[PDB]
Amino acid sequence: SMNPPPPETSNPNKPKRQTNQLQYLLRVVLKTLWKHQFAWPFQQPVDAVKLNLPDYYKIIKTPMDMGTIKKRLENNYYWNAQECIQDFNTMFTNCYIYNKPGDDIVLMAEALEKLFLQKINELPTEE
């Protein structure tokens, strides 16, 4: 049943930075993916209660979603771009772990992942 607390979006004792890459990750990469027709399952933490998936957080112990990432970027939570890319990678990987190849949700993630890889290919060099 119940949902866990969502991942933190602020941590006062974590060092933070703004870099041009992190700017780009928010203004271009996240904001492009966000507007995609297949984005909505990934825009917030999985609501396992509403979905009647009581084993979701039994299996997925490092949950991640674009809603969390968006807020992290907005709050300058990250030290560098790679920390943020890792959160995207976790989100995709979680999807592929929990679901079956060819499930609709996997097709949705895959469309987003392909687009994600296209967009980070154009990440500007650091500073």
Name the residue nearer to ligand 5VY (CB basis): 81 or 95: 95
Binder of ligand 5VY out of 25, 26, 46, 64 (CB under 6 A): 46
57 touches ligand 5VY by CB under 6 A: no
Q: Any idea what the Cα angle at residue 79 is, between residues 77 and 81, rounded to 5°?
A: 100
Binder of ligand 5VY out of 98, 110, 111, 119 (CB under 6 A): 98
Non-local (6+) Cβ contacts of 91 within 8 A are 42, 64, 65, 66, 69, 109
Tell me if 79 sits within 8 A of 17, measured CB to CB: yes
Burial degree of 117 (CB within 10 A; 0-12, 13-18, 19+): exposed
Q: Which stretch binds ligand 5VY (CB under 6 A): 8-16, 26-34, 50-58, 118-126?
A: 50-58
Binder of ligand 5VY out of 5, 13, 37, 50 (CB under 6 A): 50
Q: Which amino acid is at 52?
A: N
Residues that bind ligand 5VY (CB under 6 A): 41-44, 46-47, 50-53, 95, 98-99, 105
